[PDB]
Amino acid sequence: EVQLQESGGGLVKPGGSLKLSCAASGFTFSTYAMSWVRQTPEKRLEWVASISTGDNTYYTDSVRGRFTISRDNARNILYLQMSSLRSEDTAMYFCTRGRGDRGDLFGYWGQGTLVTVSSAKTTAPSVYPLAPGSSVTLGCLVKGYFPEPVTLTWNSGSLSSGVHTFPAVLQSDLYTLSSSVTVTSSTWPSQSITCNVAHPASSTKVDKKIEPRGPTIK
C-alpha cells in the first residue's frame, strides 16, 4: 500500500547527466521527508541525498554540486538529478520515504533503478535457445548485451519453479547470461516453451521459442 517506483535509470557516458524519477502512491505525500540510497557493484550501500518535509536538502559529500534532490508534492514524485557522473557512481538507485512524519529514516523503498557509467555503446542482445526418461531441461542464452540489465521470463512469465536464472557476466562490454528450466519429459515439446527477454533503452523486446534441433545436414 506504500509503493515507490523508480524511473529513467540506465546508461550514461562519464560527465553525462541523468534525471531519476521516483513515483509514489498510497500515502499523504507531503507529510513525510524522503531520500535516495545507492548500492555499489561491490554490493555496498551508500546514502546519497535527503529532502526534508520542507525542502531542506542534504547530500553526501562525494556528490555535492553534481547531484540535486528535488520533490514535487503536487504529483507525488521525487527526483534525483545526476550531472557529471563519475565512474564511481555506477550503481543501483533506490528512493526512500520517511519512516514516519519525522526524519529521513529509510522506512520504505522503491525497487531500484540502475545507473551504469561506461563510455560503451548501447547494444541489443542476441538470444540463443538451449534445446537438448524422467525429466528434461532446456535453457536460454543471451550472448552480448550492453548496458546491463535484462529481463528473462519463461512463457511470458507463466513458468514459476524450475527456473535458475543466473547473474549476468560482463566480458568485453557484452553481458552473457543463461537460464535453466526443468519439466517432466511429458511436458516438452508437448507444450510450447518460449524464452522472453527484454532489454530496455535499446527498446528491444525479444521472444525466442524453444524448438527441437532436427536432423538436417544436406
Partner: protein
C-alpha cells in the same frame, strides 16, 4: 562521517539456531538529551531492496517477527535472532542516523549450511542458430545442491561461469557454464564432456555427448 563496522564477514548457521550480529560504530549514536540511540538494522533478500528490520537500535518495525530483537546502545549494538529460519537467508546491515552522512556497515552474509545435496547436471550443445551468426557455446547446469564448494570440468582456453546465491527455499546453489568457442574449431573435435566433483562425489558425476554432426 561516522564509520560503521559489522563482523564477522561471512558466517554459517542452520535452521533453529541463534544468531548474533555486531555493529561497531565510530561514535556514540546515543544522545544525552532524549536518551535515544539513533541506529537501525536492515535485511536485504538478494535481488530486492532492503527492508527496515530494527530502528532506535531496539524497536521492531511493524510486521517484523518476534524472532528478531534489537539490543545494545551507544557504540556497540546487537541484532538478535531467536530461531533462524531459511526465510532469513540474506545479508544484514546496520545504519546510524545521528548526523550526516548517513552510514552503513560492511554487511554480513549468513550462508546457510543444511545438508550435502546431489548436483543435477544438464549439458547443452550450441543452438542451430548461434552457429549461424558466428560462434558457439556449450552449457551445463548444476542445480539444487549444497555445498557451494564444488568446482567442475581437455583444453580450457576461455570459459565463463555464474553462481546463484543460495535459494531461500531449499538452501541450494546452482551453476552456469559458458563454454564459449569458435564455430569451426567446434568441429575440429567430436567428443564433448562436462564433469563435477562434489563433497559427496568422490567418483564424479558426468554428462556427455558427441558432436551431432559426427
Amino acid at each position: 562521517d561516522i564509520v560503521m563496522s559489522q563482523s564477522p564477514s561471512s558466517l554459517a548457521v542452520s535452521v533453529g539456531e541463534k544468531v548474533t550480529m555486531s555493529c561497531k560504530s565510530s561514535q556514540s549514536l546515543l544522545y544525552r538529551g532524549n536518551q535515544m540511540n539513533y541506529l537501525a538494522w536492515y535485511q536485504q533478500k538478494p535481488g530486492q531492496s532492503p527492508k527496515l528490520l530494527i530502528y532506535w537500535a531496539s524497536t521492531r518495525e511493524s510486521g517484523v517477527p518476534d524472532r528478531f530483537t534489537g539490543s545494545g546502545s551507544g557504540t556497540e549494538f546487537t541484532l538478535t535472532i531467536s530461531s533462524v529460519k531459511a526465510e532469513d537467508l540474506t545479508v544484514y546491515y546496520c545504519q546510524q542516523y545521528y548526523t550526516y552522512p548517513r552510514t552503513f556497515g560492511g554487511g554480513t552474509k549468513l550462508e546457510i549450511k543444511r545438508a550435502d545435496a546431489a548436483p543435477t547436471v544438464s549439458i547443452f550443445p550450441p543452438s542451430s542458430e548461434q552457429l549461424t551468426s558466428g560462434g558457439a557455446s556449450v552449457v551445463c547446469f548444476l542445480n539444487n545442491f549444497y555445498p557451494k564448494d564444488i568446482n567442475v570440468k581437455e583444453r580450457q582456453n576461455g570459459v565463463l561461469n555464474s553462481w546463484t546465491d543460495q535459494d531461500s527455499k531449499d538452501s541450494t546453489y546452482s551453476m552456469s557454464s559458458t563454454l564459449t568457442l569458435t564455430k569451426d574449431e567446434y568441429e575440429r573435435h567430436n567428443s564433448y564432456t562436462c564433469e563435477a566433483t562434489h563433497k559427496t562425489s568422490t567418483s564424479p558425476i558426468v554428462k556427455s555427448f558427441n558432436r551431432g554432426e559426427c
